[PDB]
Structures are given as structure tokens and as C-alpha cells.
């Protein structure tokens, strides 16, 4: 136990466990915890995943059809320090300052995205302790390019739960 926050999630595949910062992004944490607290994850899913590289997720409920997001926070990527396939990170949005409710679980040595150039998009504020495999196995089952959103599990996943540990 010790003391290290972990957004625990049990998708159809199995019970996994994210682990999230806090310090480097107080604001964001508050937001998601709002959602986390309840009414959202209970029966969303995981859109999909680029093979052995990066699973999302949290967004389009089931098939994929916006909940009703848009509680626009602020700066993201510029607060996630170094790491590797294991970290979670927030998506973004056309505008810029937003990322209302949606994150994605990596796996492979990334860094590339590391805000440091004529660019800035993908946030960050977590990781992955245990059920990485689960994620994998999930990211194993075939899929298909949908149309708009490339990479979506034809035979869709369905999340069971999301319970944060102190």
C-alpha cells in the first residue's frame, strides 16, 4: 500500500491498475477525480489501441458516442516529466487548453511526444503498476480502422469499474 495513487480499472479483459501523479498537475487531478468519483467509467470502455504501443482510453461510451464532456481545464503535457511505456497521459483537443475528460495508457518507450519542439498535444500524469498484461491481452484482440477514429476493437471492450486507492 505505502502511499501512491492508482486509478484501478477492471475492463472486460481483467482488473488492471493505473497510477497517477498529482503534484505536477493539481488542477487536472481535481477534474478527473470529479468524474472518477462516479458516473462515467462505470460502463464506458477503451476505444482501442495502436498495437504493442499505446492503449487509450476512456471516452465514447461503448460503441463510441460522446458522453457530454467539455469542462475545459488548462495546460497539460507541460507537466509529466520523463518516463516510459507504463505511464498514462491525457489526450487534448483542437483548441488547446481543454482535455476535459479522456486519457490513454501507453506501453512502449515513448518520450517522442515530450513537449520540446514546434509541437504540443498529448498530456501525461500517470503510469501502470500491475495488470499491464491485461492491457496487452486487450491490445491483442483484433480490430479495425473505423472511419474517423482509426483503431477500434471491432468486438468492443466494456469497462467494469474504476476505483482509486488513497
Swiss-Prot record:
Keyword Isomerase annotated: yes
Protein function: PPIases accelerate the folding of proteins. It catalyzes the cis-trans isomerization of proline imidic peptide bonds in oligopeptides.
Top EC class of this enzyme: isomerase
Family under the similarity heading: Belongs to the cyclophilin-type PPIase family.
Chief localization: periplasm
Gene name, Swiss-Prot/TrEMBL: ppiA
GO cellular component, one term: periplasmic space
Classification via InterPro entries: Cyclophilin-like_dom_sf, Cyclophilin-type_PPIase_CS, Cyclophilin-type_PPIase_dom, E_coli_cyclophilin_A-like
Domain PPIase cyclophilin-type: 3-164
Protein name per its UniProtKB record: Peptidyl-prolyl cis-trans isomerase A
Pfam families: Pro_isomerase
Catalysed transformations (reactions): [protein]-peptidylproline (omega=180) = [protein]-peptidylproline (omega=0)
GO molecular function, one term: peptidyl-prolyl cis-trans isomerase activity
UniProtKB keywords: Isomerase, Periplasm, Rotamase, Signal
Family matches, as SUPFAM superfamilies: Cyclophilin-like (SSF50891)
